[PDB]
């Protein structure tokens, strides 16, 4: 199937308290592989997966240089955004950046991304054509003119279609055993009476990889969202993921309800009934 590489960085200003904090992480698919934290002692891009530790010193040095430089650019960018939004030097603000590419089974480029958020909201993003920008507001419009003038799009385009895809292909081969594995969900049901009149049914999916999964309740064959509750998909902490979906159900009516589980590790969807 297809794969993705992503870098996520967060920069957080701390007035009075000195320089902003900057944290970046990299993932292939749903597997983290590097981190950088401006607050920590090392001051290096660090490995967070086994299959990356094999990269040579040139790699660690290049990646360290690139990520430190970005921390400084985004520290200045916070300063600039203050001015654009006429905001005071008193409060804390956040700048977030996402970057990366998707590739198909053949390893060919599918899609690239480069986007920013200020204070948790879209600021500027590269459009899917990788030739133009979306600016979310008037401030972002000022950045968009600058980036147009300086040909930022053509630079990032070349990188996403080249360096990013070539990089993704290398990582997928080095981490083949980890990354090109699919683990299907192990599933079960739980049942708890809430009263004389009602019961909760909880449909579980455990130990699955990648994180993408769908859990849906039906009653008598019909999709149901009334009286249902679905938690966010969550890391087990060992490389796999968990999720559950519950419904509140009249006592003795359990058998009418079915949970349906879709995941790419499954040749056909599973149904569960109490």
């Amino acid at each position: 199937g297809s794969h993705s590489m992503r870098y996520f960085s967060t920069s957080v200003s701390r007035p009075g308290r000195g320089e902003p904090r900057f944290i970046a992480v990299g993932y292939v698919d749903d597997t983290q592989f590097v981190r950088f934290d401006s607050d920590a002692a090392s001051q290096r891009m660090e490995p967070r997966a086994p299959w990356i530790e094999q990269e040579g010193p040139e790699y660690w040095d290049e990646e360290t240089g690139k990520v430190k430089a970005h921390s400084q650019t985004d520290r200045e960018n916070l300063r600039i955004a203050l001015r654009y939004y006429n905001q005071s030097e008193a409060g804390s603000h956040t700048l977030q950046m996402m970057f990366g590419c998707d590739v198909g089974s053949d390893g060919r480029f599918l899609r690239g991304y480069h986007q920013y958020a200020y204070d948790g909201k879209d600021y500027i993003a590269l459009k899917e054509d990788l030739r133009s920008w979306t600016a979310a507001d008037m401030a972002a419009q000022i950045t968009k003119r600058k980036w147009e003038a300086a040909h930022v799009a053509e630079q990032q385009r070349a990188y996403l279609e080249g360096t990013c895809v070539d990089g993704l292909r290398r990582y997928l081969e080095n981490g083949k055993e980890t990354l090109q594995r699919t683990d299907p969900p192990k599933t079960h049901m739980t049942h708890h009476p809430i009263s004389d009149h009602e019961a909760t049914l909880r449909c579980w999916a455990l130990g699955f990889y990648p994180a993408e999964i769908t859990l849906t309740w039906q009653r008598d064959g019909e999709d149901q969202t009334q009286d249902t509750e679905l938690v966010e998909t969550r890391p087990a902490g060992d490389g796999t993921f968990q999720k559950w979906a519950a419904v509140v159900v009249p006592s003795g009516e359990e058998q009418r309800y079915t949970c349906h589980v879709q995941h790419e590790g499954l040749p056909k969807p599973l149904t569960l009934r109490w």
Binding site: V34, K66, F99, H114, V152
Partner: peptide, 10 residues
């Protein structure tokens, strides 16, 4: 490979 971010000035 982390991006080249020199030109990303707001």
């Amino acid at each position: 490979r982390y991006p080249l971010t020199f030109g990303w000035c707001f």
